[PDB]
Symmetry: C2
Subunit: 123 residues, 2 copies
């Protein structure tokens, strides 16, 4: 059971101008774009920030998640969480990048747990 990265979430109307800003602020000339199931929402990652773009209406449900935890194994965390007062409210579900699940911790925090599959050369 290992947390690989803790990703902070930001919500914006459009990725383009926002990305340019974060590439400058974080002094990182590249960002990742992910294939996702939700329509009307675009996802990008720069440094440890996940930029979620879409209309205020499309973004509303996404704002309920406090942060995203990239982990080595969803199953290991699922077990720990269920045995520690947490409620699995979505998934585990297969997604283009691997598998995800959304969890409500006992303290009320809502966290998205993500597990990335293989997928190879951009660097």
């Amino acid at each position: 059971m290992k947390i690989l990265q803790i990703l902070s979430r930001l919500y914006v109307a459009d990725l383009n101008p926002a990305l340019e800003f974060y590439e400058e602020l974080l002094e990182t000339p590249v960002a990742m774009r992910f294939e996702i199931p939700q329509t009307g929402v675009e996802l990008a990652q720069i440094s440890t920030i996940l930029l979620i773009a879409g209309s205020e209406e499309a973004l509303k449900p996404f704002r309920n998640t406090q942060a995203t935890f990239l982990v080595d194994s969803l199953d290991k965390f699922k077990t720990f969480l269920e045995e520690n007062g947490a409620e699995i409210i979505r998934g585990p579900s297969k997604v283009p990048t691997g598998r995800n699940m959304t969890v409500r911790h006992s303290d009320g925090s809502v966290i998205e747990y993500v597990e990335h599959s293989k997928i190879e050369l951009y660097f």
Copy 2:
């Protein structure tokens, strides 16, 4: 200028029980408690997570901030931000742990920038 860490923020009613949970969840047996100016609010850091504890009312204002960026130079970032469409909402202000400020980026994101010097 560099962003040293990007801290995600979680809001809870009581720090102690939550701290124990996250130490186990993140397999991190040590957390840091900070002396802060606010009253009725307790702040702890575990890994790159900031746990903010207090009443629903005491926490309300803190929830308006999406994340906290720890930087090496608050002044340099203030200049960069003001020159790149961001608005300085609060601060820079002196606090027990150094200095911080709240900023609203052009895209609407509200971020707390913090500088440690003690």
